[PDB]
Amino acid sequence: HMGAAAAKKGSEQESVKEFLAKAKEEFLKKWESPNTAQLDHFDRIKTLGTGSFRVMLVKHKETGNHYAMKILDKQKVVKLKQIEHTLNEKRILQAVNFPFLVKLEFSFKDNSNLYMVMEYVPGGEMFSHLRRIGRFSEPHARFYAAQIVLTFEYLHSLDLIYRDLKPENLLIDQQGYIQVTDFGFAKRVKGRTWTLCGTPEYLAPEIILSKGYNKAVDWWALGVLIYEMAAGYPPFFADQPIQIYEKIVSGKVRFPSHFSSDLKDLLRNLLQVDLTKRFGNLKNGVNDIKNHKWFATTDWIAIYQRKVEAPFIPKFKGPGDTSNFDDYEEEEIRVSINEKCGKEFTEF
């Protein structure tokens, strides 16, 4: 297939090894040596998103800068797996550094809540743009997919699994590039792990089947994401989670007639039930994905350096603009006079 062109790819691969080696050194320093603020340093502006255990737009009083503040109710974080998972999220976000990961600025806790203050990404979630437009062209989806491929290559090299890929967790920045947010399920995993967690439509079969699993679940989820971006809906699609699980385990995927054959081939190898055959999980690792024909036009270095023109630049009216986010109920934020779950969150 390659003529010359192979030598350039090989050198590129050695450079990836060199980069990941330095990246691991930087990560470990921060991972082994991690209250950078308090609540009254900020003004509440707007709720940007809500889950079971919320993310708020806030304004730092002193500097006037805007941030996204994730608030976790300490008592609500149990829920069990919540506890460990909240500690995973903070420790991981304070140690990683990559162009497509949202940056944690401060973290702190009080009597009632845990707080993580992140850079505000005003372009909105991919989710709402995708639902509004319907589906992305294959070049458009490819541009976003490439950033996820590189982000997972980075995370997996640090023994980190992400475990909640979906358009809801992908923010579009002012240059049209992706920022991955929400590391609530991310975990450092040397080999296998066993927690049943994730989002139903994006769960790999081995999670559903209560098998010990590894980083290959992220590559399955990439297949789901690429399919959803290019089709407008995910490949395993039903009203109830139990029906979704049955379709996932069946090992059967149907594609829209407008999908290119290159796209279908890539997706069949990502959405592969057999782990001995799933792309990302073979001898050549991520390079089976990066060298796939569907990515033939992708300049991986140029993506990383953010040199590629983005498909879509979100409009920004100014600092603190929330026009690219949907509206949510604005519930009260209350802090108790008495500390709650102090010992159960000592490490935070």
Binding site: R131, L196, C197, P200, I208, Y233, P241, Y245
Partner: peptide, 16 residues
């Protein structure tokens, strides 16, 4: 062809 079109909540410990 019917499925969930809104934001999807993640599951922490129990599948169904």
């Amino acid at each position: 062809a019917a499925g969930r079109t809104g934001r999807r909540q993640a599951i922490h410990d129990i599948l169904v």
